[PDB]
Amino acid sequence: KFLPFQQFGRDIADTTDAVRDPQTLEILDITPCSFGGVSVITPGTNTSN
Amino acid sequence: LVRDLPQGFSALEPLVDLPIGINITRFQTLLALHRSYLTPGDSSSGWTA
Numbered sequence: 001k002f003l004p005f006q007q008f009g010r011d012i013a014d015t016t017d018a019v020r021d022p023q024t025l026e027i028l029d030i031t032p033c034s035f036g037g038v039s040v041i042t043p044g045t046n047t048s049n
Numbered sequence: 050l051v052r053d054l055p056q057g058f059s060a061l062e063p064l065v066d067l068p069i070g071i072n073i074t075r076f077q078t079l080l081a082l083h084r085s086y087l088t089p090g091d092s093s094s095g096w097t098a
């Protein structure tokens with residue numbers, strides 16, 4: 001649970017990690033976006049594309 | 050506890066916010082005196098709290 005009268009949150013970074021709406025009395029936990037990158041594995045330009 | 054001043058640890062949380070442009074340097078608590086209907090032989094009056 002959060003504070004009785006708290007509004008937002010945060011995490012290790014400056015990013016927030018909480019939201020409150022007593023109407024829904026909701027509590028959540030936040031994480032960074034999935035995130036992704038690409039790496040290419042090529043035998044060689046002169047061997048095969 | 051035995052002593053009014055504590056030794057444990059405890060934080061605080063926000064309560065309210067009243068906006069007014071009035072300087073504050075000294076305050077005064079208010080005391081309410083309950084009316085006492087003493088008998089004639091009591092010979093007591095003047096203050097009660």
Ligand SMILES: *[C@@H]1O[C@H](CO)[C@@H](O)[C@H](O)[C@H]1NC(C)=O
Binds near residue numbers: 045046047
């Ligand atoms: C790749 O292999 C072929 C085969 O002998 C060679 O002629 C060529 O010099 C090699 N390198 C490139 C960039 O084609």
